[PDB]
Amino acid sequence: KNRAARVRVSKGDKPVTYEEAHAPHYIAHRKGWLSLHTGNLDGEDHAAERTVEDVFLRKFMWGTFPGCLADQLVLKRRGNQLEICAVVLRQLSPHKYYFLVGYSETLLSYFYKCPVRLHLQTVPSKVVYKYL
Amino acid sequence: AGSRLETVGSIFSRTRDLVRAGVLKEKPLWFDVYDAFPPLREPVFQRPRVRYGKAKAPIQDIWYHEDRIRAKFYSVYGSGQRAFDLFNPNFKSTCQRFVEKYTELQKLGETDEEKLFVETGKALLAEGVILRRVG
Amino acid sequence: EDFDTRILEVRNVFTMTAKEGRKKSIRVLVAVGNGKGAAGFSIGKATDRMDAFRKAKNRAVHHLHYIERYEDHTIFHDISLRFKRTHIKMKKQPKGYGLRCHRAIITICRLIGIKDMYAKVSGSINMLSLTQGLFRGLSRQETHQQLADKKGLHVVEIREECGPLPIVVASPRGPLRKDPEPEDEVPDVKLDWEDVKTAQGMKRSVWSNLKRAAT
Amino acid sequence: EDSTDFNDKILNEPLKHSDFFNVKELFSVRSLFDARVLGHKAGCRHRFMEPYIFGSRLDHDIIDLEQTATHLQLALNFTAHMAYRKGIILFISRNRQFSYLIENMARDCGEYAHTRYFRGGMLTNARLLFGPTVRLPDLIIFLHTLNNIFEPHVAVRDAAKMNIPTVGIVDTNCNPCLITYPVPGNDDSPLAVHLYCRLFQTAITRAKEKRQQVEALYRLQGQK
RNA sequence: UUUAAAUGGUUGUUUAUAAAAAAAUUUACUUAAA
RNA sequence: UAUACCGCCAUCUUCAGCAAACCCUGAUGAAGGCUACAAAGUAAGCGCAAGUACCCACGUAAAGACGUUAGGUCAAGGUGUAGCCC
Ligand SMILES: [K+]
Ligand SMILES: [Mg+2]
Ligand SMILES: [Mg+2]
Ligand SMILES: [Mg+2]
Ligand SMILES: [Mg+2]
Ligand SMILES: [Mg+2]
Ligand SMILES: [Mg+2]
Ligand SMILES: [Mg+2]
Ligand SMILES: [Mg+2]
Ligand SMILES: [Mg+2]
Ligand SMILES: [Mg+2]
């Protein structure tokens, strides 16, 4: 039996989001890619450095906003710009969100030497696609 | 709440008891009607069992005095040519006409069935009835 | 909220499946009763013990008997019955006697509201049969009123603590018969040897009438 | 203050009369006889139907119509009182010769009919099948109490589980033990089934109109 | 109705609960004096 | 130490079954639940199927549940328990 990135049926009480409810064979049929850059296009360079950056950014944001992220990040690259789109929860105070946005945007711009923006979308609770 | 033990008592006995205990907050709509005009038998579940040994049903065969006449007539003459019309409640068959004449001649005081049977047939023959014997 | 539930048995029954072999299930017997005569029991089955408890508890309330209690503390008369291979012989007792009966009958009695009773369970001590038999007997007990109506005679209670005073506990709602019930010189009744043997002081048991906690 | 008076004048008043709806006039023993209200052969007899059988005429059980009249009077009276009380009446029958007739009779008298295959749990699992707020029938009238394998219709047992009173035409091969208001009679001949439908449709219609008349008089008087 | 077709080391199967809580800010320029 | 596990898989599968929540039958036992001219089952969800990829509605891929073999892997990496620390 295949295992890769499959949430397995339980007793019908496990809430899954739309992203985690779709197995890998749907990545270009029902769900899209969580990162969009040019590295993996034909004749394009630096796929390796883009990949390492994505892995770091996903871990940095998970620990920088502990318990706030409601779903996976969407990493966007346009030219020199890096745009991080995060769906967060409405539990942490707004003051603390603004502090962390100013802190993460500055710290990441100096680390990867590019203009970095963080776009937060707040949800009251995790969006449940189905109960498995 | 209610009680689904349909084999323990009746719906009224169960309902009445639960209302008395306070389990049923409101008695059902039919309760008052049932109590005012109850059925002849309380509907209690009972198991049908096979009759064993000498136990027999009390249903008795329905017979009448004129059945003896009808049996003899049917044997002598058979089923009348006139077809029985069971839709008409007042329909009289040839056999019924014979029974009536037979009974009328019994009131006259004839004591012999064979003689009385012969006299009955002769009266019908005179009235124009067709009596073709099996022979 | 008036009804209280109490477990009677929890068993780990098993079946065999082609894919997994032994498949463990839980069989749970529970009894529900408000303490005012209304009490029932049900069997709940589920893989998880919590699901079995819930199913039995919720289903038992839809299968409630009503038990006729004499003076709301005991049974109207002595009931002897056999359900399958289980014999239950219950005896009516005076106030202050307590529940001198099999632990399961004690639990069911508290749910029904019976305070004083004695019962001896013989034969198979199956918990399913005992419960089903206990509810069968208590449901079928005839009240003093039902007796008066059927017999068309007064039911007169004679109490030793009240001397010869005749206490009429029930009278026939309809017409009262004027002929006295025929007094058979010798009653052709089936006597339990265990009762007769005790009345004659022939029963020595080191386990009978042992001091026990208040029930 | 007003509810108790309303209830007494309307709900409790009819219960003080032996025949408030005058269902006696709807039928006679002669009318029942002319509709062939004739049992099955003696070999098909149910033991519990023997008290209602007049006798066997050449091995054909004859139902005693003198008992039918008393049983039918009680059944029609109970049906009228339930229709007067705005009770949901459900007609159940699995005889496919009369499914069309019975379904029309129910629609005409503003009641309900179930002449189709009875699915398991319609009554005992209704809140799951229909919805948590579904209201079950207050009366169930069985025009045929046997299913199509000559066994008691499952709804007879289930109606008793739900404490729903049942009226039923019980032929000589039927089991009347759980039917609240059994009416011993022929359930096969069209003439008989057509009479039952006319009698129960009239009693329900009359009762509903009487409820409207009594309510109207109470209201007109209340104002003035 | 109709060829022959023996074997597989020992012991190892199923009961008691479940589950956190928060936080302060406290709406309105410039200046200036002694 | 894969006989503590996550992760990723083999295998039946060139399968169609696994089913929570209820209802009913067995006298309220382990359990069982169908007959269409129908007789107690209703069933969310999962798989199959349907859709999608490739050159079609075909074919091939992909997919393939719950479980079975304490099946493979502490040597992809991570990690519970035990052990080493000149
Ligand atoms: K390890
Ligand atoms: Mg594979
Ligand atoms: Mg019939
Ligand atoms: Mg050997
Ligand atoms: Mg071996
Ligand atoms: Mg392994
Ligand atoms: Mg190995
Ligand atoms: Mg295809
Ligand atoms: Mg393949
Ligand atoms: Mg498929
Ligand atoms: Mg291994």
CA nearest to B1 within chain C: C62
Output the CA–CA distances (angstroms, integers) from residue B114 to B73, B76, B78, in the order listed.
12, 12, 17
Nearest-angstrom CA–CA distance, B61 and B70: 16
Give the CA distances from residue D72 to residues B85, C5, D57, D134, D142, in Å, rounded to whole numbers and listed in that order. Answer: 29, 45, 23, 31, 13
Are the Cβ atoms of B2 and C65 closer than 8 angstroms? no
DSSP string, C65-121: EE---BTTTB-SS-EEEEETTEEEEEEE--TT--EES-HHHHHHHHHHT--SEEEEE
Integer Cα distance of C118 and C106 in angstroms: 10
d(CA A123, CA C59): 41
The sign of the dihedral angle between the CA atoms of D26, D29, D33, D39 is positive
Residue C51 and residue C108: Cα distance in Å, rounded? 22
HSE, CB side, 13 Å, CA atoms: give it for residue B91: 9
Checking DSSP bridges between strand A15-16 and strand A130-131, what pairing results, if any?
A: antiparallel
Q: How was this structure determined?
A: cryo-EM
Q: How far apart are CA B41 and CA B10, in angstroms?
A: 11
DSSP per residue over A34-76, as a string?
Answer: SEE-STTSTT---HHHHHHHHHHHHHHHHHHSTTTB-S--EEE
First to last CA, chain D: 18
| Contacts for A80 with CB less than 8 Å, ≥ 6 apart | A114, A115
CA distance A82 to A44: 18
Between CA C40 and CA C42 the distance in angstroms is: 7
Tokens in use for C96? 């202050």
Kindly determine whether residue B4 and residue D45, on different chains, have CB atoms separated by under 8 Å. no
The residue among B3, B7, B12, B37 with the most chain D CBs within 10 A of its CB, best to mutate, is B37
Of D145, D191, D170, D211, the residue nearest D72 (C-alpha): D170
Cβ proximity of D38 and D57 under 8 Å: no
Radius of gyration (C-alpha) of chain B in whole angstroms: 29
The answer to whether residues C107 and C33 touch, using CB atoms and an 8 Å cutoff, is: no
In Å, how far are A47, B41, C52, D54 from D51, measured between CA atoms?
Answer: 95, 11, 46, 8
First to last CA, chain B: 77
Minimal CA–CA distance to C32: which of D123, B1, D158? B1
Q: A81-89 and A116-123 as β-strands: parallel, antiparallel, unpaired?
A: parallel
Contact A101, A118 (CB under 8 A): yes
Sign of the torsion formed by the C-alpha atoms of B28, B33, B36 and B42: negative
Give the number of other CB atoms < 10 A from CB of residue C185: 4
Residues D173 and D150: beta-carbon distance below 8 Å: yes
Contact C65 B18 (CB under 8 A): no
CA gap B126, D80 in Å, rounded: 58
Measured CA distances, B59 to B41, B53, B65, B67, D185 (Å): 20, 17, 19, 19, 17
Residue C207: strand pairing partners? none
Provide, as residue numbers in chain C, all residues whose Cβ is less than 8 Å from the Cβ of B22: 2, 34, 36, 38
Ligand 3 (ion): residues with CB under 5 Å are: D 171, 187-188
Separation between Cα atoms, residue D204 and residue D113, nearest integer Å: 14
Copy the structure tokens of residue A86.
């995060």
Q: What is the DSSP letter of D150?
A: S
Q: Match 């995060």 to its residue by tokens.
A: A86
- Given a contact cutoff of 8 angstroms between Cβ atoms, the answer to whether D87 and D139 are in contact is yes
**D52 and D185 in contact (C-beta within 8 Å)?**
no
| Backbone break loci in chain B, preceding residues, C–N > 2.5 A | none
* Identity of the amino acid at A127: V
Query: Which phi and psi angles does B127 have, rounded to 5°?
Result: -80, 0
Task: Tell me the C-alpha distance between C104 and A37, whole Å.
Answer: 73
In sequence order, the β-bridge partners of residue C27 are C11, C45
* CA D51 centroid distance within chain: 21
Contact indicator for D159, D181 with CB cutoff of 8 Å: no
Tell me the CA–centroid distance for residue C21 and ligand 4, in Å.
30
How far, in Å, is the CA of A129 from the C1' of nucleotide F45?
Answer: 13
Cβ-defined contact of B39 to D180 (cutoff 8 Å): yes
- With tokens 């699992």, the residue in question is D125
Q: Do B3 and C63 touch (CB under 8 A)?
A: yes
CB-based contact B93:B69 (threshold 8 Å): no
Pair C70, C91: CB distance under 8 Å? no
Asked whether strand E has any atom less than 7 Å from the CB of A91, the reply is yes
Residue A32 contacts by C-beta under 8 Å, 6 or more apart in sequence?
none
| Cβ–Cβ under 8 Å, residues D181 and D170 | no
Strands C79-83 and C86-92 come out as: antiparallel
In whole angstroms, E7 C1' to C23 CA is 32
User: How far is Cα D141 from Cα D169, in angstroms, rounded to an integer?
Assistant: 8
Cα-based distances in Å from D119 to D101, D108, D116, D140, D160: 21, 25, 9, 16, 17
Q: Is the CB of C19 under 7 A from strand E?
A: no
Angle, in degrees to the nearest 10, between helices A94-112 and A47-64? 150
Distances (CA, A) of C11 to C8, C29, C44, C115, D30: 10, 9, 11, 29, 64
CA C92/CA C111 separation, integer angstroms: 18
Closest nt to C60 (CA→C1')?
Answer: F28
Residues of D with CB below 8 A from B45's CB? 160, 177-178
For B97, phi then psi, to 5°, come to -60, -40
Distance (Å, rounded) from C-alpha C151 to C-alpha C176?
A: 9
CB pair distance less than 8 Å for B36 and D15 = yes
Tell me how far the alpha carbon of residue D164 is from its chain's centroid: 12
Nearest CA-CA distance, residue B45 and chain D, Å: 5
Which among D214, D212, D213, D206 is positioned nearest to D10, based on CA atoms?
D214
What does the alpha-carbon distance between residue D170 and residue D182 come to, in Å, rounded to a whole number? 6
Select the residue of B14, B29, B36 nearest D87 (Cβ to Cβ): B29
| 3-class SS string, A91-127 | CCCHHHHHHHHHHHHHHHHHHHCCCEEEEEEEECCCC
- Element at D170 (helix H, strand E): strand D166-170
Residue spans of beta strands (DSSP E) within chain C:
4-17, 21-33, 38-46, 64-66, 79-83, 86-92, 99-100, 117-123, 155-157, 167-170
Calculate the alpha carbon distances from D168 to A99, C102, D44, D141, D156 in Å. 79, 45, 19, 6, 9
Q: How far apart are CA D18 and CA D74, in angstroms?
A: 10
Beta-carbon count within 10 A of D191 CB: 13
The structure was resolved to a resolution in Å of 2.6
Query: What are the distances in angstroms from CA D18 to CA B40, D78, D79?
Result: 15, 11, 14
Selection from A66, A71, A62, A67 nearest residue A21 by Cα = A71
Q: Work out the burial of residue B10: count CB atoms within 10 Å of its CB; fewer than 13 is exposed, 13-18 middle, 19 or more buried.
A: buried
The one-letter amino acid code at A113 reads K
Read off the DSSP letter of residue A83.
Answer: E
> Cα distance from C64 to chain B (closest Cα, Å)?
5
Q: How far is CA B96 from CA B99, B100, C132, C199, D37, in A?
A: 5, 6, 63, 77, 24
β-strands C64-66, C38-46: how paired? Answer: antiparallel
Q: Pairing between strand C79-83 and A15-16?
A: unpaired
The CA distance from C214 to A1, in Å, is 61
Residues of C whose CB is below 8 A from B23? 34, 38, 64
Integer Cα distance of C120 and C111 in angstroms: 19
Start-end of H helices in D8-142:
29-34, 65-84, 99-108, 126-129
CA C5 to chain centre: 17
Instruction: Return d(Cα A82, Cα A64) in angstroms, integer.
Output: 17
